A = this chain, B = another copy of it.
């Protein structure tokens, strides 16, 4: 419990909504996407403006509260809710200003991808982000951020030009290439370690309809499909994006009844460019195996962003183990095929992603984001509903990771699970981590922002 004078000064200065443990909406407001994370904050501060974040940050500093920051709540490590502290909740700060003439967007730190993509696509514009519309822009960008447009236009952070950020001392800074560039380097891949970003400014690109295809392959054909994918993507043009999701076949009308609920490869591909060139490019990779339940469409980019994933049935409980690879050996391929065959939940996916492209043409040290040179990402994304089944699904993710871990290097900070705080050094590597620690010593010396993949100062 808190100082009255400190709390009263906070309440007068705070324009947003405060949510106490006794309030009706406390239980829904403290839930985040990873439902296995059950925590009880002392206070949830729903900010509506940059002055609100300044007041909440100062309040937390003086009062000694543990600080959780929440954008869209999608932390796979559960960092956006704390026990006994304050949640600086940005979900009500989701305004977007788009300039069609300048090809610029200014978005508040609480935006969801779908709101952002709606605003830019009102002008046939877009900039890279993740593939699920209700992910938060805040956490996604600060870790790097990749999706459909990334092989063509880079990570989200490769299109970011400045941020407004509230630092631990309550001061509001602007960071960019011309102002506080040490800070600007660190927020592009260093997470929420350095303060609360209340505004992101992006460069946008013209993105009209995209030819898109999704289809399913029998695991019978697993070896030939994954090897075709790995070989083709090594030399594919930047305009082609092709991703593999190993999962149980959803009970959908386009799929034969005898495939429902059985392990399959779900392959999703799109061409960022001319749709007629796209139709020719996709037809030539869709028949690596016999395609079942093939869906082909020419979609507005916003509808591509909203498509993922097939089945659309939001899971309650999640556990992820992820890593990068430099190559995908035959030994690795048979390992992922064997564990795909043991998937138990219809909501679990073993994701095989290929980045590279424009992501890999940015020099390594240009941003805080690591592993630009590793084009492969594997993600064992277990998801389920029943809390008494946690061990079964968590064990699938862990045993698959361990069987693969020798082939893996690094790790995407935004795919880390609640027990992977120790993976931070191996994620960034030694030189980036050390540079990150020096920025942290300058801007967050007391480590006030430690619910993240944390970088201790000095």
What are 17 inter-chain pairs, A to B, with CB distance below 8 A? A28-B101, A48-B48, A92-B97, A94-B95, A94-B96, A112-B119, A112-B122, A118-B134, A118-B306, A121-B312, A123-B314, A254-B279, A254-B298, A295-B297, A299-B312, A302-B306, A303-B303
Q: Shortest beta-carbon distance, A87 to chain B, in Å?
A: 15
Contact status B28-A114, CB under 8 Å: no
Contact status A119-B134, CB under 8 Å: yes
Residue A86 CB within 8 A of the other chain: no
Residue A100 CB within 8 A of the other chain: yes
Q: Shortest beta-carbon distance, A272 to chain B, in Å?
A: 13
Q: Which residues on the B side are within 8 Å of A208 (C-beta)?
A: 312-313
Residue A311 CB within 8 A of the other chain: yes
Residue A67 CB within 8 A of the other chain: no
Docked complex Cα distance between A307 and B302 (Å): 8
Residue A161 CB within 8 A of the other chain: no
User: Residues of A with Cβ closer than 8 Å to B?
Assistant: 15, 25, 28, 48-49, 91-97, 99-101, 112-115, 117-119, 121-124, 133-134, 208-209, 211, 252-254, 275-276, 278-279, 295-303, 305-307, 310-314
Docked complex Cα distance between A364 and B382 (Å): 51
Q: Which residues on the B side are within 8 Å of A297 (C-beta)?
A: 254, 295, 297
Q: Which residues on the B side are within 8 Å of A99 (C-beta)?
A: 25, 28
Q: Shortest beta-carbon distance, A422 to chain B, in Å?
A: 31
Query: A102 — nearest CB in chain B belongs to which residue?
Result: B28
Docked complex Cα distance between A124 and B316 (Å): 12
Closest 4 CB pairs of A and B: A114-B118, A122-B134, A300-B312, A253-B279
Docked complex Cα distance between A307 and B121 (Å): 12
Contact status A121-B94, CB under 8 Å: no
Q: Shortest beta-carbon distance, A129 to chain B, in Å?
A: 12
Contact status B302-A275, CB under 8 Å: no
Which of B113, B121, B133, B296 is in CB contact (< 8 Å) with A134? B121
Contact status B112-A254, CB under 8 Å: no
Q: Shortest beta-carbon distance, A285 to chain B, in Å?
A: 15
Docked complex Cα distance between A122 and B28 (Å): 13
Contact status B28-A211, CB under 8 Å: no
Query: A305 — nearest CB in chain B belongs to which residue?
Result: B306
